Amino acid sequence: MDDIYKAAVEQLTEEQKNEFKAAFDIFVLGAEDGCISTKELGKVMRMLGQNPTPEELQEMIDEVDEDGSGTVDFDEFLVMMVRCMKDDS
Ligand SMILES: [Ca+2]
């Protein structure tokens, strides 16, 4: 975990986390603690306007997950987005 991605999540604009913060609450609307589970991620992205595959959902998530929790919180949830936004070198 270098200091490159950490800045990628902060570089986001205030309007980016403002609108996404709303949808995020839509996936946790069913969760028990208030987080977006990877199981619904597919439906979460399908309506968000994305087209993630079934093997990429958990894969990418389990890859960006650092607290070894399994659910995608605003912390890992954002890193998973900036990832598909900026990949490769
Ligand atoms: Ca996690």
From Swiss-Prot:
Domain of life from the UniProt record: Eukaryota
GO process annotations (BP): cardiac muscle contraction; diaphragm contraction; muscle filament sliding; regulation of ATP-dependent activity; regulation of muscle contraction; regulation of muscle filament sliding speed; response to metal ion; skeletal muscle contraction
A GO cellular-component term linked to this record: cytosol
Repeat among keywords: yes
Residues annotated as binding Ca(2+) 1: D65, D67, S69, T71, E76
Phenotypic consequence of C84Y: In CMH13; increases calcium sensitivity of the myofilaments
UniProt keyword annotation of Acetylation present: yes
Outcome, altering A8V: In CMH13; increases calcium sensitivity of the myofilaments
Disease: Cardiomyopathy, dilated, 1Z: A disorder characterized by ventricular dilation and impaired systolic function, resulting in congestive heart failure and arrhythmia. Patients are at risk of premature death.
Protein name: Troponin C, slow skeletal and cardiac muscles
Lineage of the species this protein comes from: Eukaryota, Metazoa, Chordata, Craniata, Vertebrata
GN (gene name): TNNC1
Whole-protein coverage range: 1 to 89 of 161
